[PDB]
Amino acid sequence: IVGGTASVRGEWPWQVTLHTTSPTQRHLCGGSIIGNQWILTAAHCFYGVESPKILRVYSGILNQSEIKEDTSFFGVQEIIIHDQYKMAESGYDIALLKLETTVNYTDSQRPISLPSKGDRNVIYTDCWVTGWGYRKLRDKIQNTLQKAKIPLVTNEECQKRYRGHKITHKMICAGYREGGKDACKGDSGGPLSCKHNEVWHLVGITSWGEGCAQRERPGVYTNVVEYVDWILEKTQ
Numbered sequence: 001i002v003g004g005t006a007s008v009r010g011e012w013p014w015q016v017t018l019h020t021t022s023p024t025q026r027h028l029c030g031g032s033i034i035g036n037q038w039i040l041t042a043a044h045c046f047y048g049v050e051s052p053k054i055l056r057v058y059s060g061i062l063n064q065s066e067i068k069e070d071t072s073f074f075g076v077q078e079i080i081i082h083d084q085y086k087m088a089e090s091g092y093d094i095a096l097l098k099l100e101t102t103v104n105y106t107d108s109q110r111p112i113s114l115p116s117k118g119d120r121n122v123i124y125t126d127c128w129v130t131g132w133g134y135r136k137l138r139d140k141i142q143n144t145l146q147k148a149k150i151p152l153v154t155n156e157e158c159q160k161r162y163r164g165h166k167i168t169h170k171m172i173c174a175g176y177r178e179g180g181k182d183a184c185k186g187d188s189g190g191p192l193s194c195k196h197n198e199v200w201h202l203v204g205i206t207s208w209g210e211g212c213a214q215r216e217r218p219g220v221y222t223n224v225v226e227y228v229d230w231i232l233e234k235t236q
């Protein structure tokens with residue numbers, strides 16, 4: 001996260017850190033708890049992942065340094081990537097992880113609701129991106145989970161900033177015109193979380209962008225409301 005600040009324990013309890021363990025263990029992507037055995041993340045995260053065997057899901061983590069050889073994690077039973085996914089910039093950047101067992105929810109590990117039926121025309125004004133990613137283009141994964149409030153941008157404005165890409169209704173864009181706050185490398189797959197009537201909703205999945213926090217180049221997010229039927233179908 002560029003231009004963000006440190007979170008505290010329990011502040012974003014649906015946020016998980018997905019680790020790969022091949023050829024060495026490291027943070028791969030963010031993700032969001034949406035059910036006791038279900039994580040929602042980005043399909044691009046699994047580029048070069050040979051199978052679910054090498055994945056570890058860690059929840060209730062504030063600092064990456066908390067993760068040691070005895071830290072509990074969830075195994076991944078199945079990776080479900082959208083059938084039309086080809087690359088993040090073309091859309092369909094969405095994946096479900098089915099865990100091998102059920103999260104018992106606690107103060108530090110909680111689900112986030114999907115955008116609610118009948119809320120299609122809600123204007124979200126309280127949206128936050130979170131993650132352990134770079135603070136600038138040439139950086140490193142951060143120890144403490146970071147947060148930044150970022151305003152949504154209309155798809156018309158977003159298309160004007162990305163005339164070489166097709167910005168569809170299945171994407172949502174977010175950023176300041178002057179830049180300075182954005183997701184960056186290592187934040188992909190995590191949530192764009194928006195609070196409405198004091199309830200948090202998973203509005204976006206961090207997906208792609210031209211650079212990090214550049215002027216007039218918003219971050220692009222998978223528009224979760226447009227995949228609710230797909231999510232319900234896979235998780236039934």
Ligand SMILES: [O-][n+]1cc(-c2c(-n3cnnn3)ccc(Cl)c2F)ccc1[C@@H](CC1CC1)n1cc(-c2cncs2)cn1
Nearest residue numbers: 044045183184185186187188206207208209211219220
């Ligand atoms: O995470 N992440 C974020 C963005 C991104 C950007 N960025 C544009 N240029 N950089 N970021 C801007 C706006 C928005 Cl919304 C973004 F989602 C693009 C790509 C990635 C991921 C894809 C990898 C997982 C397949 N990635 C992770 C790493 C590293 C991990 N460990 C050390 S490096 C490098 N790439």
